[PDB]
């Protein structure tokens, strides 16, 4: 049975499962992370905390990527209870979510419709760029230094998101520049915002949500 | 057998006798107990050559073998925690005494530290500035305790872990006192931020004579 | 057809280790030097396996690091239960090719990846570097001067083929890798580099990073 | 599935990984057995030691034969410890060899791209002629009474030797003519070894240097 | 490919192996059976005792007809052990050979390249007709009361049996029929032989080799 | 799918179309098997235990297999419950639900036609029961007769004509031989013996069958 | 209880007592404790009804199990085998005596066979004419001694049997007599060429009431 | 009960006595406990009937086992080292001696071989000449002791192996003498180049005749 | 019983006593516990002929198999860590060896003994022993070990050692005049492990034996 050919048809699948799916933008902001998608619902979440300065978002398939979404918290947890809660990190997880989209994709019948976004910022205190990791249905991991973008129709979000990007941007202006980029391929009843704060002292994941989101849209 | 750890003002020293008996009998006599287990880490045990070595062997290839593996040491706690799952997983015995310095602590010359282990393989960190395991563990610290107002710096201190060993050895026929006929001493490690290093036999020898004149 | 399967297995993981950025790894005065096109802070092509012995590989991460591990964990088991002179590069290079060749001939995927092991003496001995390269079949071949690995490689290896100088000092055996990349800007923002240095007395791995790396450059 | 069809692919494949290898020679001579290969490798092994008399040659993929090379020493140490040393024979190996190429062969997805030679001289103080066995790829085993190559292209070595084939050959001799033979398809490119039958137990020996060069 | 074709192909993969492979003659005479077959090896025996009034025969390939030689002595001992020596028969054995080369047959991809002779002779003080049987490649079992061919051409060597074979014929008369019908379709250096000598008290099976075959052809 | 079943089918009838032929019939005493069967060991018809008996035609390492098979089962039952417990009915359902599984998770199917017959316990009077199972796991309640193997349609039209309910031995014994036709060196034949204190199974062989024929 | 066999010029006749208890109470006078378990054997059990009967059943549902698997049955030495293997699996208790007639054996007259087991499972064939098991085995051992010359037939053997088995209820508790007022005797089986047959309760009765007779 | 086993020049011989005993009581009169266990070699078990047949049958079916499969005996290092695999798989109680004759031996007069087995299973290749097993086995050794020198033959070892087992018995009570009364005698075994025989029970009884007279 | 190994200039040697006793009885006279094991080591082990041969058979073997597998042999610390890893698997061996990887060929000789829980130690006392007379043949070297100057004076002391032992412990044999039976020894240096002649233990023990008489 071709190899090539089994491999093409996955690939086929899983690419228009998550082209079918809403689109999900996470990007480097002056504060951390910024995690902005397009979620008509106000139960089933897009985008998580995983461990205390790292965060998830997702696009695709929600019974998939909340699987994943679920084990990530479960190794995460498992990994800084066995060692120290600084060994758990957006690039072991990232990395984790690789082997795993992986095994999943050679081994299992139907590939993952999905595409993950694993982001790291610096402990309190301390100066680190945040990191951000794509990971794609095939086990792809790709590290991003400015912006993530997944699901849906990529091309003319990412191109967008291109020219309007800057470093360092404040809160607000990096949540409009997002809003605007998801515009190009919507307020408070369609959205999913939070961010990870490196200001926060160990959890850094917060959540936008309600009358102080519509605040700074 | 004896093991002694104390801090001092920059780091932190680790020293053990060289006695191992087999009931009444003088077993060893050149017994190291006290090893260096990565940068910034020493273990000792109160227990046989082997038992020693075996642990210090296998702590040692976990810490580097997470730093090879993740890129980064584990930090101080993560150390600690490793130490502790490989002690209660070898209890289910001497326990082991380990010193090290945490390069990441805010205060450099606070930054050393003393972790000892319970019968039931429970940790504690030690805040008074010393510790001692073993069978002259309660001599030691006694002595320690009336001398540890003299603790300066680094030398002061190796003198005093080794007066500690001295005052154990004279009170405990299981610990190993310095031998002058066949120029054994006790051994002993030194950590500070420019890392663990094993101290030279000649320096214990100078210190063990110093202390035996001025008793004599 | 078992013949044509092979084939197209074979071409698979050609093609996706030809998609990848480059590696190389030459002997040099020293010992042996690594030289990655790697813009990622993160993750890495290049690391120590054990106390001589030194990895380096191109493709996909999440398998090549799959394997980095594994190379890992069994050193440090060889290691414990023999000696540490028991792991060396043509017993680490050997495994390697056993899991490839499992991997490739039993896998609905073979890994598309291309993996060097690096060996050189141990402190105040002398014995020439051995160099070790194994492929995505598991096929494992003693290279005595240089190793290339990923993306397009004839351009690479025949500038080195004209470029190369035994014995050469660290700076010299620096260049000359760089040019022999570029021909397949390179600053110290996109390397990453290191070292198994015989003068190390234990652990030979070290890393040039940084405005150490500049130095050199 | 067809058997016919399958079985004929499988062979071509292996056939074909065969000869795109490098070349090896076994042959019989007055002081035991010779093995000669055409390798340019330092490390990377084609001719070994198996058990006392013992010895081991192949050609194919390395990862595959270096597999086998290992699991038939894991086999002959096993039952030398559970009966005595004299049970292990290069009958026995090979009957091995044959079994687990044949598996190989029927359950996995591609076959073994190999070919074995398993050689046994006589023990110390006996007469008894060597036995030279060829396994290949399919668990075919044929008792080779002189000569056995494997590898590349077979015909043109195989009968280069059929012509210049002494039976007591020397040494020196023997070495020649297969050097000579494998030309017909130095010391950096050869792997030279014997099972002498005049060593007390091990009679695997390697010819390398110095030494070999004294010999061609 | 079809059912009925399937078994088709497997018998001709079968038929051409054992075709293709040297002949073996086992016949019933005075004081036994006798075995002989053209075999050039000292080593890679084809006659074998099995227990100790049940012999064995085999042509085709090495591997799987020892493997099954082994399997039977495994298969008589156990027997033995758990009920009493006279349990072990030819007819048991050679139904246990039936059934194991049945399922190769069926169950596994490749049918063995094989043709098996059990024979029997009587016990010590017994008056017992020997017995002979042919179990072949699919688990045909077939008894026969005067002589069994197996391997390579066998329809010219059975009948220059029919045309020299005579019952209650001497050791020395026996093998001369014996040799001469092998030879129409050879002396100790390329022969082994082998009787099921009914006069030895417990265990039948003596070989015949060296000076004292000489002595006999 | 339905292929797969109709070219098993086919592969199966054809070996025991191949194969010798096998007659089991009902009768005064009884149940009387008769089989072509030239070997002196290798044999078709068995006891499987003390009421009921087995006749098979196809391979022989087939249904040895499941002669073998049935013994195991009927001991192990017989022991874990009552003597009574092991019944014809019973047997043939483990052989058709045996064969059945064969037919569907074997590369090959059984090339066997299996007849178990079972007569009534000493001093009771029930009517003999015989139950046909085939390759498929197929069964079949026969009342008079049961034939397999070989050409099946010119033996079982023969009996129809010529059989006769509450028949004796000996003539029992030779409407059967002259329907298979349609001698004691090609012949295999025994009787389930309803007059058996316990073992009905008994085999009329040599000097002893000559005289009924 | 007790259970006596013994051989007989022709034959082997195996004959048992009646009684259970518990403690020093009588719990059953009417045990069966000997058994035909073909048509060459018997087995007894100095054990309970349930035992006895059990062991006997399991037995003969082995024997009977082979006979029909293979169209023959066990040899005698494959019987003693089966029956080993099977006491051996419940001493993972009281102790079995087997009574066989072997029909292969060339003295027909010495043909008859008694087979018991040890504490540790272990069987024997006897050779000295009779054996016994049971708490009055050594009562009816030492009266067969002194009446076994007296033995030349079935008949005078079964006498031998009745008498030892009264001999051990006459001083032996456990083991029980004769019973005139119900009319209960010692069961017994008699085997010999044309094979196993139970011993009519009347010509036991008949042997019990002259035993008793004569002693008074 | 006493095995005794010497070794005489070209050969060696095994001797058994018959009794078993329960405490006190003799439960045995006829036990054999040598026996022939393949062409070379016997095995004799200070035990019960079964203990001493059970472990000769088993052996003897390894051996013949080992024979068939691979169309060779195993050497006689390998035959003890299967012995030694089951007696210590039986403890994990009476231990085997071995004796045996082995053929590849360079000097034919000293092939003749007796091993032993200790309370924990290990062996021992008997140096001295003779060994013994069993209650009597002190008596035995300390009469063979001062016999031993007669030894020049097997007729004279056979007769000396006789007089130890007499000795035995005449100073254990679990070890039986020569019954002239029933006419049962010890078994034996003799083994040298031409393989191993019982000794006709005829000519130990006329040893053990002799033996009796000369006393008297 | 008593093994003991002592440290000459470049080599070891090690002896053992021969005998082996059930309580007070004398099981053996000829008891063989020093086993060479590779080319450069040998293990002595004071208990039966079985342990120390199986101990030594098992530990060979598994140094052998390391090389064949390997093709270099294990260093001298991979030796003791598959010997550590034997006993804590599985009375207590003494191992004589010599590191042909040394800096100094005249100190390369080793010993290592293990404690009761199989902890192992290398001893750098100059020499060592194990079993019942250990005490006696540790005070015995104390005394005399000043004289060990090479090969042969090392052979001496290890020989006059077992004689201390067997003078004082009854489970420890002294040398058999009558028997002609000796301790054994095993000598190593830089050219490999070699069996002490039986000639040269007996000419040592003769003048050991008129030196106190």
Same sequence: chains 1, 5.
């Avoid at chain 1, 202006?173 to 939070?194: K, T, Y």
């Avoid at chain 2, 390069?103 to 510790?131: L, M, T």
């Amino acid at each position: 049975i071709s190899p090539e050919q089994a491999m093409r048809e996955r690939s086929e699948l899983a690419r228009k499962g998550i082209a079918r799916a809403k689109s999900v933008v996470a990007l480097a902001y002056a504060g951390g992370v910024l995690f902005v998608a397009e979620n008509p619902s106000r139960s089933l979440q897009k985008i998580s905390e995983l461990y205390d300065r790292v965060g998830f978002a997702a696009a695709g398939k929600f019974n998939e990527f909340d699987n994943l979404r679920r084990g990530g918290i479960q190794f995460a947890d498992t990994r800084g209870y066995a060692y120290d809660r600084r060994d758990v990190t957006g690039r072991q997880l990232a990395n984790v979510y690789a082997q795993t989209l992986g095994t999943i994709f050679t081994e299992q019948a139907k590939p993952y419709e999905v595409e993950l976004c694993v982001a790291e910022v610096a402990h309190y205190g301390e100066t680190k760029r945040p990191e951000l990791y794509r990971i794609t249905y095939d086990g792809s991991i790709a590290d991003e230094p400015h912006f993530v973008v997944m699901g849906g129709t990529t091309e003319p979000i990412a191109n967008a998101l291109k020219e309007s990007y800057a470093e360092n941007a404040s809160l607000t202006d990096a949540l409009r520049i997002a809003v605007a980029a998801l515009r190009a391929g919507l307020g408070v009843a369609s959205l999913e915002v939070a961010v990870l704060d490196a200001n926060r002292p160990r959890r850094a994941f917060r959540r936008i949500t309600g009358s102080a989101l519509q605040a700074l849209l | 057998x004896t093991i002694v750890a104390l801090k001092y003002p920059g780091g932190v020293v680790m020293a053990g006798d060289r006695r191992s008996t087999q009931g009444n009998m003088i077993s060893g006599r050149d017994v190291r107990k006290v090893y260096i287990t990565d940068d910034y880490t020493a273990t000792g045990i109160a227990g046989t050559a082997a038992v020693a070595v075996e642990f210090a062997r296998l702590y040692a290839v976990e810490l580097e073998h997470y730093e090879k593996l993740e890129g980064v040491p584990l930090t101080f706690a993560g150390k600690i925690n490793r130490l502790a799952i490989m002690v209660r997983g070898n209890l289910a015995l001497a326990l082991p005494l380990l010193a090290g310095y945490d390069i990441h602590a805010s205060d450099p010359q606070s930054a050393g530290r003393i972790v000892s282990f319970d019968a039931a393989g429970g940790w504690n960190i030690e805040e008074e500035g010393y510790q001692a395991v073993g069978s002259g563990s309660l001599f030691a610290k006694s002595s320690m305790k009336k001398l540890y107002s003299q603790v300066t710096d680094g030398d002061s201190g190796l003198r005093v872990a080794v007066e500690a060993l001295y005052d154990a050895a004279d009170d405990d026929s299981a610990t190993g006192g310095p031998d002058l006929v066949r120029g054994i001493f006790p051994t002993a490690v030194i950590i500070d931020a420019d890392g663990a290093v094993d101290v030279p036999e000649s320096r214990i020898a100078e210190l063990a004579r110093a202390i035996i004149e001025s008793r004599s």
